[PDB]
Amino acid sequence: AVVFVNKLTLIGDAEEFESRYEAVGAFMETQPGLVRYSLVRSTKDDSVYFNIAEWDDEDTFRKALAEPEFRRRLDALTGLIKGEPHLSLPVRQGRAAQVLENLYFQGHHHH
Amino acid sequence: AVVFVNKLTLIGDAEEFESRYEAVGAFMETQPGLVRYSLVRSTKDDSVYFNIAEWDDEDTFRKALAEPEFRRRLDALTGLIKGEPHLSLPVRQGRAAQVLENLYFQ
């Protein structure tokens, strides 16, 4: 898996930016290789967002990025945000299933 | 849910940073409210990492950070990285959908 992380700086209207991002996320949802994505907004500095997307691999991320209609919805955000994008590799991970498993094992093993 | 994002800049040895971060990840996994976390390293600028940690709510995140053991293991990263921390609220999210989803008319 690869994890796309874009640190966004809001330079326009927050509500307009977020509604337009909706169409980007909608499109990503049936792009091959997309696992999940989240747009999150900092509570410390509300001009700071992060676009975070997990992809099966680098090749599927590459092929999705090139799709004209995806790029059209992405381009509709230019002028509302500036981006500092990072295609990134997982280095250490606490998977949800494993976090849950360690909890219920400690509680139900009765060591 | 809330998503903590820390943009980390490496200022020492990457291998030791990553080994010492193992202890931080381990302790997080024992704390009430943790959903999941990933530490990822940028392939554009390899001095950049992001810690991305998902918690049930701000409350559980704040309560975990009040643990002395958590603070001890964070303090062991001093000199290896610098942080830009952001507790963040999900604004939009989704996951892989079925291409045929709308053709059931359910």
Numbering used by the authors:
A (entry chain B): 2 to 112
B (entry chain A): 2 to 107
Which sentences did the original study use to describe this structure?
The monooxygenase RslO4 crystallizes as a homodimer and the overall structure of each subunit is made up of three α-helices (α1–α3) and four β-strands (β1–β4) with a ferredoxin-like fold. Together with an additional β-strand of the other subunit, a five-stranded antiparallel β-sheet, which is stabilized by ten main-chain hydrogen bonds between β2 and β4 of two chains. The interface between the two monomers is further stabilized by hydrophobic interactions provided by β-sheets and side chain hydrogen bonds contributed by Lys8, Ser43, Glu85 and His87. The closest structural homologue is SnoaB from S. nogalater, with a sequence identity of 41%. According to the observation from molecular dynamics simulations, Trp56 contributes in the orientation of substrate positioning inside RslO4 pocket through an H-Bonding network with the three –OH groups, which in turn leads to an electron delocalization in the third aromatic ring. The results of dynamic simulations match those of the Site-Directed Mutagenesis which demonstrated the importance of Asn7, Asn52, Trp56, Tyr22, and Met29 in the catalytic mechanism of RslO4.
In this study the involvement of one cyclase and two oxygenase in rishirilide biosynthesis was investigated. For this purpose, excision of rslC3 gene using the markerless time-saving CRISPR-Cas9 system, inactivation of rslO4 gene using Redirect® technology, and crystallization of RslO4 and RslO1 proteins were carried out.
